[PDB]
């Protein structure tokens, strides 16, 4: 997926998917 988040996100999901 090219349209996914390209930025750094410290508040992204830190858990296991």
């Amino acid at each position, epitope marked *: 997926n*090219p*349209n*996914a*988040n*390209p*930025n*750094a*996100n410290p508040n992204a999901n830190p858990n296991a998917n």
Partner: antibody, heavy 123, light 107 residues
Framework: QVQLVESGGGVVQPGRSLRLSCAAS????????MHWVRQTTGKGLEWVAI????????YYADSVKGRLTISRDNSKNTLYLQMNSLRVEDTALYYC????????????????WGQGTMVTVSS | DIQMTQSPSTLSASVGDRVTITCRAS??????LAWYQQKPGKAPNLLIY???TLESGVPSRFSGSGSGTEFTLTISSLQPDDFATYYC????????FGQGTRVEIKR
């Protein structure tokens, strides 16, 4: 001041090379994905390539695959665009744009644009 | 390849007018749409993202609307610095721009 300053343009012959720079200042360059978007009066605004914030993912348009490679130096806050085997179809004004950090499922809004650098390929 | 078509291509307007710009989508793009403004010799500037959210620092006269395949950029009261060209860009699948809409001064 948040801004993007580009360099490396010029007129070259078909088949030669050219390296475009996009120096960033005023914000945290290491935490932003970057794009290259070229513009002509015939094709309009056309996306070229995208680089991830850490450089782990790269994606190119079909018309530039293999010939154009996008890179990034977070240590110097500069975005690069290596252009090889240049065709006359690559003649355009090239921009570098920052991906807006607006949380959603898709990301593609450009909130900061460079001033543009001109590439003219001709024999 | 998702194609962005803008209607109309050129429109006349005066200072204080309500202008409306249409952006068609070849396929559904939900609300993944951006609106830009470009003045001659200058890079484009983002006005609207996510179809209707207003970019910070942009005059509130600008407003976007629509979802799916039909979208709209609206300027409730056009000001002299609004005479430029406006592009719509989708970001549902890759990135594609419209052909642009020139806003000429009416006479």
């Amino acid at each position: 001041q948040v801004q993007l300053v580009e360099s490396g343009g010029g007129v070259v012959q078909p088949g030669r090379s050219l390296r475009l720079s996009c120096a960033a200042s005023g914000f945290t360059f290491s935490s932003y994905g970057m794009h290259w978007v070229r513009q002509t009066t015939g094709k309009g605004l056309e996306w070229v390539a995208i680089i991830w914030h850490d450089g782990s993912k790269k994606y190119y348009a079909d018309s530039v695959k293999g010939r154009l490679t996008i890179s990034r130096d977070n240590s110097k806050n500069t975005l690069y665009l290596q252009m090889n085997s240049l065709r006359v179809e690559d003649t355009a004004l090239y921009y570098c744009a920052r991906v807006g950090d607006y949380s959603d499922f898709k990301y593609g809004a450009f909130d900061i644009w460079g001033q543009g650098t001109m590439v003219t390929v001709s024999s | 390849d998702i194609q962005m078509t803008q209607s109309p291509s050129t429109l006349s307007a005066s200072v204080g007018d309500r202008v409306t710009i249409t952006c068609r989508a070849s396929q559904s793009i939900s609300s993944w749409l951006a609106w830009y403004q470009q003045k001659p010799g200058k890079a484009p500037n983002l006005l609207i993202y996510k179809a209707s959210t207003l970019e910070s620092g942009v005059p509130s006269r600008f407003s976007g609307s629509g979802s799916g395949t039909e979208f709209t950029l609206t300027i409730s009261s056009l000001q002299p610095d609004d005479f430029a060209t406006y592009y719509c860009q989708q970001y549902n699948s890759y990135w594609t721009f419209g052909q642009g809409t020139r806003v000429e001064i009416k006479r």
